[PDB]
Amino acid sequence: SLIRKKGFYKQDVNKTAWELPKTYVSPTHVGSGAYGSVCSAIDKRSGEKVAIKKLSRPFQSEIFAKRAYRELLLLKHMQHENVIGLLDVFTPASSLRNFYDFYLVMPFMQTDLQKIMGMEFSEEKIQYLVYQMLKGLKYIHSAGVVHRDLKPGNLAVNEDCELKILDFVTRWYRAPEVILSWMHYNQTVDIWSVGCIMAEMLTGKTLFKGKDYLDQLTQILKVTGVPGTEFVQKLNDKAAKSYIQSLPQTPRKDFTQLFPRASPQAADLLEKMLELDVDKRLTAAQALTHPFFEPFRDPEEETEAQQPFDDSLEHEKLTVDEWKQHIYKEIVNFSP
Numbered sequence: 001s002l003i004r005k006k007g008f009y010k011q012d013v014n015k016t017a018w019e020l021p022k023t024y025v026s027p028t029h030v031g032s033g034a035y036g037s038v039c040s041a042i043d044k045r046s047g048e049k050v051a052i053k054k055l056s057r058p059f060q061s062e063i064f065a066k067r068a069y070r071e072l073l074l075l076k077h078m079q080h081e082n083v084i085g086l087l088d089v090f091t092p093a094s095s096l097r098n099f100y101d102f103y104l105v106m107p108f109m110q111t112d113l114q115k116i117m118g119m120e121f122s123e124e125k126i127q128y129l130v131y132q133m134l135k136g137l138k139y140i141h142s143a144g145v146v147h148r149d150l151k152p153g154n155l156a157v158n159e160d161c162e163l164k165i166l167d168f169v170t171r172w173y174r175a176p177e178v179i180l181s182w183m184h185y186n187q188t189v190d191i192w193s194v195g196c197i198m199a200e201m202l203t204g205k206t207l208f209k210g211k212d213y214l215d216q217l218t219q220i221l222k223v224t225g226v227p228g229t230e231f232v233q234k235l236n237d238k239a240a241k242s243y244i245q246s247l248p249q250t251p252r253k254d255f256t257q258l259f260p261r262a263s264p265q266a267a268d269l270l271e272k273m274l275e276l277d278v279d280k281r282l283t284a285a286q287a288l289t290h291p292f293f294e295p296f297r298d299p300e301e302e303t304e305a306q307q308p309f310d311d312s313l314e315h316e317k318l319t320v321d322e323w324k325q326h327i328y329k330e331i332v333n334f335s336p
């Protein structure tokens with residue numbers, strides 16, 4: 001019967017209190033977020049710099065407890081060099097009544113792609129970063145998990161341009177079939193995002209903006225060209241079928257004319273990732289084989305997940321307290 005488990009100290013971090021185990025020292029505020037806060041730390045065991053996320057009131061609502069539970073499960077399931085993973089998870093609580101929040105420990109990443117964007121990267125850097133992106137996407141897709149919100153702010157990089165995929169209205173990087181829901185989407189939605197990111201790296205300029213869904217669609221069709229019947233039939237929205245069939249049928253493309261600084265292989269890969277047809281758009285596994293990644297491709301590194309991510313409670317409707325017992329029990333039996 002304690003106030004917190006022995007080995008935990010209290011310390012204010014960016015105007016708020018934190019309870020950490022002994023082994024983590026030198027907490028330094030990194031950022032505030034929608035559902036928690038993040039600081040940096042030093043594991044006095046190994047000596048590595050880690051990142052710790054305190055969840056802010058995860059048990060305030062069924063939606064929030066389900067959210068935090070899912071994030072812990074995802075971080076626990078993914079074991080890939082280009083996907084952020086779990087090092088430790090702990091709570092200062094001693095029973096279920098003191099259980100108010102928990103902390104996640106992750107490898108520390110210096111920055112992300114949104115903060116260093118616009119510097120018109122060389123073809124080499126685009127090759128390396130995009131190749132890592134597609135490896136992480138192949139892995140998470142192989143686990144049955146789709147990101148749905150990939151963007152430069154969700155691509156962390158360190159000093160060596162080593163990349164990991166993260167997660168936590170501007171919709172510049174979302175696939176058209178998602179913004180318009182004009183056909184049912186598959187995993188290749190993430191692939192569209194990669195294209196939008198890669199093009200930005202080539203140009204230093206965001207590809208599709210738009211102040212509403214229709215304007216962004218017009219900007220997109222400026223690049224993809226108005227699609228032909230072969231595609232228009234696959235749409236399930238009839239009003240969008242009519243709108244597309246009513247547009248001035250403006251043909252594609254010419255991606256080597258859209259990005260004059262783009263190499264033919266880069267322009268080609270960009271052609272195949274920015275494809276309106278969700279059945280013709282490259283998968284991550286297919287995009288890894290493109291000749292644009294020849295100087296870096298190592299198929300042994302293009303791993304899949306052993307097991308699909310199995311959130312059996314993904315649909316369940318439990319009280320906040322039941323979710324609490326689930327998360328708590330998940331914390332204790334976690335093991336490094």
Ligand SMILES: Cn1nc(C(C)(C)C)cc1NC(=O)Nc1ccc(Sc2ccncc2)cc1
Pocket residue numbers: 030038051053070071074075078083084106107108109110140145146147165166167168
């Ligand atoms: C929900 N979800 N889904 C995924 C995928 C990519 C496997 C699909 C990952 C997460 N959670 C998460 O990214 N949490 C998180 C992100 C950023 C920080 S801040 C930070 C992290 C590492 N180094 C420095 C700062 C903290 C936690």
